[PDB]
Design an enzyme around this catalytic site. Structure first.
Site, short mmCIF file in Angstrom:
data_model
loop_
_atom_site.label_atom_id
_atom_site.label_comp_id
_atom_site.label_asym_id
_atom_site.label_seq_id
_atom_site.Cartn_x
_atom_site.Cartn_y
_atom_site.Cartn_z
N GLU A 1 44.10 34.31 52.64
CA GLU A 1 43.19 34.04 51.52
C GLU A 1 42.53 32.67 51.69
OE1 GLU A 1 41.75 35.36 48.57
OE2 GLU A 1 40.74 33.41 48.71
N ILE B 1 36.05 37.20 37.83
CA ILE B 1 35.76 38.05 36.69
C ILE B 1 36.47 39.40 36.91
CG2 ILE B 1 33.64 39.10 37.58
CD1 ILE B 1 34.39 37.92 33.96
N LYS C 1 46.67 44.28 25.26
CA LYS C 1 45.51 45.14 25.09
C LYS C 1 45.98 46.44 24.47
CE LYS C 1 42.00 47.74 27.69
NZ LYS C 1 41.18 47.70 28.95
N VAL D 1 39.74 34.03 57.45
CA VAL D 1 39.52 34.88 58.62
C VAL D 1 38.15 34.57 59.20
CG1 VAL D 1 39.28 37.24 59.45
CG2 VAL D 1 41.08 36.69 57.81
N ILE E 1 39.37 47.36 38.86
CA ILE E 1 40.79 47.20 39.14
C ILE E 1 41.51 48.54 39.05
CG2 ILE E 1 42.95 46.15 38.35
CD1 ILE E 1 41.28 43.86 37.21
N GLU F 1 45.07 59.80 30.59
CA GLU F 1 45.97 59.86 31.75
C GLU F 1 47.14 60.81 31.46
OE1 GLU F 1 45.09 57.03 30.04
OE2 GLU F 1 44.70 55.36 31.41
N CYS G 1 50.11 37.70 14.91
CA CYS G 1 51.06 36.68 14.48
C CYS G 1 50.40 35.76 13.46
CB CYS G 1 51.57 35.87 15.67
SG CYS G 1 52.73 34.54 15.24
N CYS H 1 57.41 36.49 17.78
CA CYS H 1 56.20 36.41 18.58
C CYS H 1 56.55 36.04 20.02
CB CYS H 1 55.25 35.38 17.96
SG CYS H 1 53.65 35.20 18.78
C1 LIG Z 1 30.70 41.09 35.36
C2 LIG Z 1 31.87 41.87 35.87
C3 LIG Z 1 32.87 42.26 35.00
C4 LIG Z 1 33.96 42.99 35.45
N1 LIG Z 1 34.91 43.37 34.58
C5 LIG Z 1 35.99 44.08 34.98
C6 LIG Z 1 37.06 44.50 34.05
O1 LIG Z 1 37.02 44.24 32.84
N2 LIG Z 1 38.08 45.20 34.55
C7 LIG Z 1 38.17 45.51 35.85
O2 LIG Z 1 39.16 46.18 36.23
N3 LIG Z 1 37.24 45.15 36.76
C8 LIG Z 1 36.16 44.44 36.41
N4 LIG Z 1 35.18 44.06 37.34
C9 LIG Z 1 35.35 44.39 38.76
C10 LIG Z 1 36.33 43.36 39.34
O3 LIG Z 1 35.84 42.01 39.16
C11 LIG Z 1 36.57 43.64 40.82
O4 LIG Z 1 36.65 45.06 41.00
C12 LIG Z 1 37.86 43.05 41.39
O5 LIG Z 1 37.96 41.64 41.13
C13 LIG Z 1 37.92 43.32 42.89
O6 LIG Z 1 38.96 42.55 43.48
P1 LIG Z 1 39.15 42.55 45.07
O7 LIG Z 1 40.59 42.19 45.39
O8 LIG Z 1 38.55 43.82 45.64
O9 LIG Z 1 38.16 41.36 45.55
P2 LIG Z 1 38.12 39.85 44.95
O10 LIG Z 1 38.98 39.70 43.73
O11 LIG Z 1 36.66 39.46 44.92
O12 LIG Z 1 38.83 39.04 46.13
C14 LIG Z 1 38.23 38.97 47.43
C15 LIG Z 1 38.90 37.80 48.13
O13 LIG Z 1 38.53 37.71 49.51
C16 LIG Z 1 38.56 36.33 49.86
N5 LIG Z 1 37.84 36.13 51.14
C17 LIG Z 1 36.53 36.36 51.36
N6 LIG Z 1 36.20 36.09 52.66
C18 LIG Z 1 37.32 35.69 53.29
C19 LIG Z 1 37.69 35.27 54.66
N7 LIG Z 1 36.75 35.22 55.64
N8 LIG Z 1 38.97 34.93 54.90
C20 LIG Z 1 39.91 34.98 53.93
N9 LIG Z 1 39.65 35.36 52.66
C21 LIG Z 1 38.40 35.72 52.28
C22 LIG Z 1 37.98 35.62 48.65
O14 LIG Z 1 38.47 34.28 48.59
C23 LIG Z 1 38.52 36.47 47.50
O15 LIG Z 1 39.70 35.91 46.89
C24 LIG Z 1 34.07 43.32 36.90
C25 LIG Z 1 33.07 42.92 37.78
C26 LIG Z 1 31.98 42.20 37.31
C27 LIG Z 1 30.89 41.75 38.24
C1 LIG Z 2 48.17 58.35 27.73
C2 LIG Z 2 48.05 56.95 27.10
C3 LIG Z 2 48.33 55.92 28.21
C4 LIG Z 2 46.62 56.78 26.65
N1 LIG Z 2 45.55 56.78 27.51
C5 LIG Z 2 44.39 56.61 26.77
C6 LIG Z 2 43.07 56.53 27.18
C7 LIG Z 2 42.10 56.33 26.21
C8 LIG Z 2 42.44 56.23 24.87
C9 LIG Z 2 43.76 56.31 24.47
C10 LIG Z 2 44.76 56.50 25.42
C11 LIG Z 2 46.19 56.61 25.37
C12 LIG Z 2 47.10 56.52 24.19
C13 LIG Z 2 48.48 57.15 24.45
C14 LIG Z 2 48.58 58.67 24.28
N2 LIG Z 2 49.95 59.08 24.60
C15 LIG Z 2 50.67 59.84 23.56
C16 LIG Z 2 52.08 59.94 24.10
C17 LIG Z 2 52.28 58.66 24.90
C18 LIG Z 2 50.90 57.97 24.85
C19 LIG Z 2 50.44 57.24 26.12
C20 LIG Z 2 49.00 56.72 25.89
C21 LIG Z 2 50.74 56.99 23.69
O1 LIG Z 2 51.66 56.59 23.00
N3 LIG Z 2 49.47 56.59 23.52
CL LIG Z 3 38.51 48.96 29.63
ZN LIG Z 4 52.81 33.47 17.41
#
Ligand SMILES: Cc1cc2nc3c(=O)[nH]c(=O)nc-3n(C[C@H](O)[C@H](O)[C@H](O)COP(=O)(O)OP(=O)(O)OC[C@H]3O[C@@H](n4cnc5c(N)ncnc54)[C@H](O)[C@@H]3O)c2cc1C
Ligand SMILES: CC1(C)c2[nH]c3ccccc3c2C[C@@]23CN4CCC[C@]4(C[C@@H]12)C(=O)N3
Ligand SMILES: [Cl-]
Ligand SMILES: [Zn+2]
Ligand SMILES: CC1(C)c2[nH]c3ccccc3c2C[C@@]23CN4CCC[C@]4(C[C@@H]12)C(=O)N3
Length: 664
Positions: A68, A77, A106, A166, A410, A492, A595, A611
């Site tokens: 890294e 982000i 969440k 890298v 993610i 799911e 809380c 909490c």
């Molecule tokens: C505005 C926005 C909002 C988002 N919101 C969400 C969200 O709410 N939930 C969600 O699940 N996803 C979200 N995403 C998507 C999310 O940000 C990415 O999918 C996720 O961070 C991807 O992670 P990764 O491990 O693939 O790459 P990254 O997290 O980008 O990591 C890549 C790594 O490679 C390293 N690297 C690069 N070149 C080299 C090299 N030559 N040598 C060594 N290391 C190097 C960098 O340092 C970096 O740490 C969002 C994206 C955007 C743009």
């Molecule tokens: C499947 C689950 C992860 C889920 N995935 C969602 C996607 C979008 C909106 C809501 C959900 C929920 C709520 C759920 C519904 N399931 C009822 C039995 C166990 C469970 C797991 C959970 C529960 O208690 N709540």
């Molecule tokens: Cl979400």
């Molecule tokens: Zn508290």
């Protein structure tokens, strides 16, 4: 377990830089190895997910080094995670009591659809998460999540090297046994680059596509793309003046409108903390997870900060993700001096509900260092046409990406990460056990499904994104068509059956439901209609009617076909048990509470009386989930019973799929 301050004291004793204190926790050592089975480029969330899953799936089989370039886990982000991610964390030995010390709770997702032509009018779509005794979802600060996974990897025989880069000009990747020579430097300036001889390289460099870009040009989808601009704000204890009815800070909230949408994610921030101190805090938490320390006897987040000399605050992540066919005035200098700042504040004042909402929040300056008050990123969605080849594969963002909406980055992207992790064991063994040509041919064949899955995954996610965006143009289509179909197709089903062995197979079958046929059919009908109405116009009411009736006609049949039992009227606030829209319905389950002391959102479960964030005791009552419709004592007992422990791996069970049951 008594807390230890190993890394805090090691760093001070040797005046160690950030990268050096982190790398000193590697099993093989702080310096690079001469050889390794797998070299992972990038320790973002996916590189680490990949390494953790590969070692957990088959321990003591692959030597794995993650490279890294950041000196410590850096800002990213992408903060909202979903039940499949938490389930993965739990399967790796970290349950909710420990994850909540580091990350924000969440409890589901919520949408508010703002009428553009009738400023002030809005509709909503709200869902819940789960009882505290079932599962949780997380809002994660990415430098903390990537520290957590670095330490956990190091504690499971994986080496992770921060502050190392890298060199993709001198690196050699080949498909014959251990043909790879991975060049690792400290940067362009480095005179002393090292080489790790290895069998397999994993491109986890995210959107930078640092390796696979050499194999194919980046690919863009037809039509408009998106831009995003975002910043970080205070998190109010008192959310009651937020201008949306029944708003809850522990949802991932979506403010939607014709041009795009705004995300709102409450999450704790550890910024300002020394890295060695955080290593000590994370390590202590893992030792408590190892020991099985109950939640009430585990120190609260703020107490951990005191113990280990950390900084802790509550912040709200707020960003726009809008189409790039939006027309902006040429002069925006009245809304700030940076483009990101300018377009952010300009978009807020275009919607009274957005301005009223934003007036509950105070801007934080440079939370992640200088220059980070504002962020902008343009042309979000893309796909890598080539994601594997002799000696290498790609995972995560390096395969493609669409949009923040529904967080596929993610939670869907970890299907590639975890599948690639599982595939890595035979790929490396093939190269060790057969001559070069046949090994390479057998590896190519083995990876065909991985290539095909990746190829078709991003376009399906792109159609999912456009589906929601076009429906966000009307306050009936958004909740009643787009959101309804995403939740019905993408909930799911049978997630409680998943284990380490089946996880990748289950994950690649999810896709947030975007592969479900009735989903795609409704998505295509809507996109085909709405895309013909210019953005600056309102959808004709007849178009909404026709699309709504079409969606509901496909819906009733697809819902009947689903053999999965689900108290839908308890999960979606606006819908009945058969997913019919109900105009005035507000009844829903209640799994969380705020809380009174610190404002943090808490899970209701009888064995957590305090909490987890500040340690304040709530009254011995509360803590009781509200089931509406009610559940008996037996029915509630059977619910939590299924979600306690994951099933042992059964080589003869067929995997039950997350998607709805097909029709006959
Ligand atoms: C505005 C926005 C909002 C988002 N919101 C969400 C969200 O709410 N939930 C969600 O699940 N996803 C979200 N995403 C998507 C999310 O940000 C990415 O999918 C996720 O961070 C991807 O992670 P990764 O491990 O693939 O790459 P990254 O997290 O980008 O990591 C890549 C790594 O490679 C390293 N690297 C690069 N070149 C080299 C090299 N030559 N040598 C060594 N290391 C190097 C960098 O340092 C970096 O740490 C969002 C994206 C955007 C743009
Ligand atoms: C499947 C689950 C992860 C889920 N995935 C969602 C996607 C979008 C909106 C809501 C959900 C929920 C709520 C759920 C519904 N399931 C009822 C039995 C166990 C469970 C797991 C959970 C529960 O208690 N709540
Ligand atoms: Cl979400
Ligand atoms: Zn508290
Ligand atoms: C369904 C199957 C073809 C499959 N499809 C995948 C897709 C992605 C990743 C892995 C798989 C697998 C491996 C499976 C899982 N099944 C468990 C019971 C029988 C079977 C068939 C087989 C088995 O033994 N191995």
């Amino acid at each position: 377990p008594t807390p230890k301050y190993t890394f805090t004291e090691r760093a001070a004793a040797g005046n160690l830089s950030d990268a050096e204190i982190l790398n000193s926790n590697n099993p093989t050592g702080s310096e690079l190895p001469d050889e390794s089975d797998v070299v992972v480029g990038g320790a973002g969330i996916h590189g680490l997910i990949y390494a953790l899953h590969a070692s957990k799936y088959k321990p003591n089989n692959l030597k794995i080094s993650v490279i890294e370039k950041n000196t410590r886990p850096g800002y990213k982000i992408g903060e909202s995670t979903l039940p499949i991610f938490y389930t993965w964390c739990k399967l790796h030995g970290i349950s909710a009591a420990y994850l909540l010390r580091l990350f924000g709770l969440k409890d589901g997702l919520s949408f508010y659809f703002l009428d553009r032509e009738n400023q002030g009018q809005y509709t909503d779509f709200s869902s819940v998460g789960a009882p505290g005794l079932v599962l949780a979802s997380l809002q994660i600060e990415r430098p903390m999540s990537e520290l957590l996974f670095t330490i956990l990897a190091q504690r499971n025989g994986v080496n992770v090297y921060h502050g190392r880069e890298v060199d993709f000009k001198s690196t050699v990747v080949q498909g014959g046994g251990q043909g790879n020579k991975i060049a690792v430097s400290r940067g362009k300036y480095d005179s002393t680059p090292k080489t790790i001889d290895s069998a397999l390289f994993v491109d986890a460099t995210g959107r930078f596509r640092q390796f696979c870009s050499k194999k194919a040009p980046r690919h863009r989808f037809d039509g408009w793309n998106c831009n995003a601009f975002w910043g970080y704000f205070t998190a109010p204890k008192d959310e009651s003046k937020i201008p949306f009815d029944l708003y809850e800070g522990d949802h991932t909230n979506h403010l939607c409108f014709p041009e795009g949408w705004v995300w709102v994610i409450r999450l704790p921030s550890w910024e300002g903390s020394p890295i060695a101190n955080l290593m000590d805090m994370v390590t202590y938490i893992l030792e408590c997870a190892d020991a099985g320390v109950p939640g009430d006897e585990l120190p609260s987040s703020e107490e951990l900060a005191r113990m280990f000399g950390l900084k802790f605050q509550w912040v709200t992540s707020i960003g726009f993700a809008v189409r790039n066919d939006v027309k902006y005035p040429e002069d925006l200098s009245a809304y700030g001096t940076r483009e990101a700042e300018q377009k952010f504040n300009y978009f807020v004042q275009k919607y009274e509900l957005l301005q009223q909402f934003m007036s509950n929040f105070e801007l934080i300056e440079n939370l992640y260092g200088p220059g980070t008050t504002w962020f902008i990123r343009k042309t979000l969605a893309y796909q890598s046409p080539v994601v594997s080849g002799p000696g290498w594969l790609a995972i995560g963002d390096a395969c493609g990406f669409t949009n923040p909406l529904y967080s596929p980055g993610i939670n869907v992207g970890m299907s590639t990460s975890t599948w690639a992790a599982q595939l890595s064991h035979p790929i490396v063994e093939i190269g060790k056990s057969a001559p070069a040509d046949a090994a390479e041919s057998s590896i190519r064949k083995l990876l065909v499904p991985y290539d095909d899955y990746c190829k078709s995954l991003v376009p399906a996610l792109e159609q999912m994104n456009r589906f929601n965006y076009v429906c966000y143009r009307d306050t009936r289509l958004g909740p009643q068509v787009a959101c309804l179909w995403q939740f019905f197709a993408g909930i799911e089903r049978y997630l409680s059956d998943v284990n380490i062995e089946t996880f990748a197979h289950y994950a690649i079958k999810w896709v947030w439901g975007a592969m479900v046929p009735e989903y795609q059919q409704v998505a295509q009908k809507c996109i085909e209609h709405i895309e013909t109405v210019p953005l600056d116009e309102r959808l004709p009411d007849a178009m909404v009617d026709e699309l709504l009736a079409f969606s509901n006609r496909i819906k009733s049949a697809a819902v009947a076909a689903d053999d999965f039992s689900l108290r839908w009227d308890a999960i979606l606030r606006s819908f009945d048990r058969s997913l019919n829209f109900v105009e005035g319905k507000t009844s829903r389950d209640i799994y969380t509470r705020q809380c009174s002391g610190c404002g943090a959102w808490l899970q209701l479960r009888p064995d957590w009386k305090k909490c987890h964030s500040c340690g304040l005791l709530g009254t011995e009552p509360q803590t009781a989930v509200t089931f509406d419709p009610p559940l008996t004592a037996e029915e509630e007992a059977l619910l939590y019973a299924a979600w306690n422990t994951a099933p042992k791996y059964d080589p003869s069970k067929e995997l039950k799929l997350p998607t709805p049951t097909r029709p006959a």
